[PDB]
Design an enzyme around this catalytic site. Structure first.
Site, PDB file in Angstrom:
ATOM      1  N   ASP A 110       0.317  -7.825   1.333  1.00 41.07           N
ATOM      2  CA  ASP A 110       0.664  -6.400   1.591  1.00 41.07           C
ATOM      3  C   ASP A 110       2.180  -6.270   1.795  1.00 41.07           C
ATOM      4  OD1 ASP A 110       0.315  -3.644   1.760  1.00 41.07           O
ATOM      5  OD2 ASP A 110      -0.272  -3.715   3.855  1.00 41.07           O
ATOM      6  N   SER A 161       3.816   2.272   9.793  1.00 40.78           N
ATOM      7  CA  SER A 161       3.435   1.265   8.771  1.00 40.78           C
ATOM      8  C   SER A 161       4.613   0.967   7.836  1.00 40.78           C
ATOM      9  CB  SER A 161       2.146   1.577   8.029  1.00 40.78           C
ATOM     10  OG  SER A 161       1.727   0.492   7.240  1.00 40.78           O
ATOM     11  N   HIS A 185       0.834  -1.238   0.000  1.00 42.02           N
ATOM     12  CA  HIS A 185       0.000   0.000   0.000  1.00 42.02           C
ATOM     13  C   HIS A 185       0.853   1.265   0.000  1.00 42.02           C
ATOM     14  CE1 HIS A 185       0.107  -0.311   4.533  1.00 42.02           C
ATOM     15  NE2 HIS A 185       0.113   1.011   4.448  1.00 42.02           N
TER      16      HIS A 185
END
Lengths: 296, 296, 296
Positions: free
Chosen positions: C82, C163, C46
């Site tokens: 991911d 993240s 992402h």
């Protein structure tokens, strides 16, 4: 090289169980704790609320650490403290939780909020005790009454995955029962009191006065909204628009502390209520009624 | 067997106080810290904003650890740093907080966010320092200006129950002032600077350039939106649509860091501003004005 | 007197990097970790999704602890886990992260969620491992597929600032990769598997059956919604309205665990599927197809 929290969490896993309430078109899940070797399990009322109100359609099962699934029976429930007691029959060698003393808890005390390992989204969370004797409102799951509890507040997360499970000190002792209904737990000393009434009587009796309160703050307490006819409140002199500032020996800051203060009173014994009426400070006397007279 | 955090939290409880601002139809509550033995108490500006803007109707009181309630007087306030200084008169044997050095704080440092024990929903939270020199916007409580502070970020929870209270290191030293206006605190070194001006002058002067900025990011800084007429900005050559990439010796990533960078500048001294104008890199020179000339 | 977490956080800072993807009218930022001395950097998909889907307009750069900014090249990406692998060319003396074993992680283990110090709103968070093997859905950033991962759950905060960064044990070993797409990380053992395929093949192949599932719970599994024509599912006997209760040797509680269970299967090998069909318990046999046949 086992960690501080890893060891504590591991020692209590066997004392914590999954609680599942299923029907034809629904399922509900929660955590609970073995408090008695005969098979007594304590959880929140909201976890089993639906099965208690619709028992013809709901089946409750307890899932142990070793995968064992056992049918469970409801002994009693207290929507007012969000507590419920279950009982599993003839199960050998249970690991009973070591119950602590919530009076000896202090702000800063490190804690774990343990959910049952065999739960779908079970969670183990860590934090500290952030506040003691913190009145907290709780929403009623189904037809159940909304309540307020004198809680232990913690910065450990309390969610669906650990609700009903134990709040644990650094000695692996249960100091509270997690309720997710910013973490809040019901103190172990209160759970010990309510669990004993539920095991023995299948129910518990709480005091009532007949007052609906709203909170007020200016130059602070519970503003009387509605007084029921023939209530101990009306028979004590309490009028509408009064500001309750003290119930018994407990000062009241708002509607939340009022609810908790009333449940600390003795049923049938005269008790003082201090109110500010149109500016004047008035002390009245009330005798509390049982919420349930037939069980009292 | 007192816990690590329990001991630290206990040693500072006497240095933290409840601050209550009440009127006929409202009440506001917050936490604060004793920084001077003469009776100087520091809190956030948002806690007392209303009492400062409407002093004819609001009364401020300080509630100590020993239940003692004392009237308080506003010395000064800085909406730009969200800081305010109160003073209680002739109170004997105060426990003054041990002030730390925020320059010596590091990421990973364990901390407590202490609220005043005698607060309604007071909270003590634990965590670590997650970031240093983190520009953070803050909303203005009433008629107050929204601002941005160069904060210490922490994973300890900062909420209504600990706002205005101290952020504390493992040596029981205040390294910051909690602001709940994902935790953020104002560094102790900045509070020491602003508190000294507020005690002495009843006010503080901050630099101004006359620029409204929006943030920009592509192939990054503060985009000039509005320039006021007769501003040091217009008189320095700054045009609208410029991208501010450096103020003084401080690089700027966005509108937030711009606001903090301008307040680090010296009033009346020439300062360099680097801007990207239609592609070209341009360096200009500005001399900052006082936000309040009569107090400067 | 360096703190427990301060030391750990400090030892890994050099192994963590900022990842910036910019265009003419946008910028995106994330964290990543040096896993190979040749210059291999792992992050979330992402973080770089947009640059991968629009490579003619997006430029990716890696910013190191020492301020060094280096152009980066996409090696491969897995929207299904991911995960994405970047490569910086000819950079001397990199500090390569010490990779751990996620199989040896336990509930209660203290951890740090480290973001790249040179990030705009970079964050370092502390907590404990709250759950292992927790299926978690993730939203697809752009045109990317939404997925579900078998994650490590933690009470440490995972947000935009950490993240793509590492989840770190108390031995400064990466046990996971933070994903903010209540904290969730992808286990290091899974990242090791996916990273090796991405470095070597520029891609990775996952199993497919051709089933869209919805979750069901009553007196519990994945309800078959849509079966694609010519799917291994249709050719195995799977009908619509079936309840998948076990895929391979893995029991399935819902649609989330189904997705994770299918990716644990071997491509081209017969595998058992247990379904409840109109009350009857039926066991079928399926042979999984590659999601991408040309790379298989």
């Amino acid at each position: 090289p086992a960690g501080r929290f890893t060891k504590v969490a591991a020692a209590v896993a066997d004392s914590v169980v999954t609680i599942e309430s299923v029907s034809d078109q629904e399922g509900m899940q929660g955590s609970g704790v073995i408090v008695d070797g005969r098979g007594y399990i304590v959880t929140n009322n909201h976890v089993i609320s639906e099965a208690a109100n619709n028992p013809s359609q709901f089946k409750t099962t307890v899932v142990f650490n070793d995968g064992k699934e056992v049918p469970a029976n409801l002994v009693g429930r207290d929507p007012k403290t969000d507590l419920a007691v279950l009982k599993v029959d003839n199960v050998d060698n249970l690991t009973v939780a070591r119950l602590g003393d919530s009076s000896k808890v202090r702000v800063g005390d490190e804690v774990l909020a343990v959910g049952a390992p065999l739960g779908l989204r079970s969670t183990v969370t860590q934090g500290i005790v952030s506040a003691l004797h913190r009145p907290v409102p709780l929403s009623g799951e189904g037809s159940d009454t909304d309540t307020v509890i004198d809680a232990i507040q913690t910065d450990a997360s309390i969610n669906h995955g650990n609700s009903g499970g134990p709040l644990i000190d650094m000695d692996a002792q249960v100091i509270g029962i997690n309720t997710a209904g910013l973490g809040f737990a019901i103190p172990v000393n209160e759970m010990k009191l309510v669990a004993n009434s539920l095991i023995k009587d299948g129910a518990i009796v709480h005091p009532t006065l007949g007052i609906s309160t709203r909170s007020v703050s200016n130059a602070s307490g519970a503003q009387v909204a509605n007084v029921k006819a023939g209530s101990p409140a009306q028979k004590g002199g309490i009028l509408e628009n009064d500001v309750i500032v003290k119930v018994g020996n407990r000062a009241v800051a708002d509607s939340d502390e009022f609810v908790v203060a009333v449940r600390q009173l003795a049923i049938g014994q005269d008790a003082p209520i201090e109110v500010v009426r149109e500016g004047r400070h008035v002390t009245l006397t009330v005798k509390p009624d049982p919420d349930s007279t037939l069980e009292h």
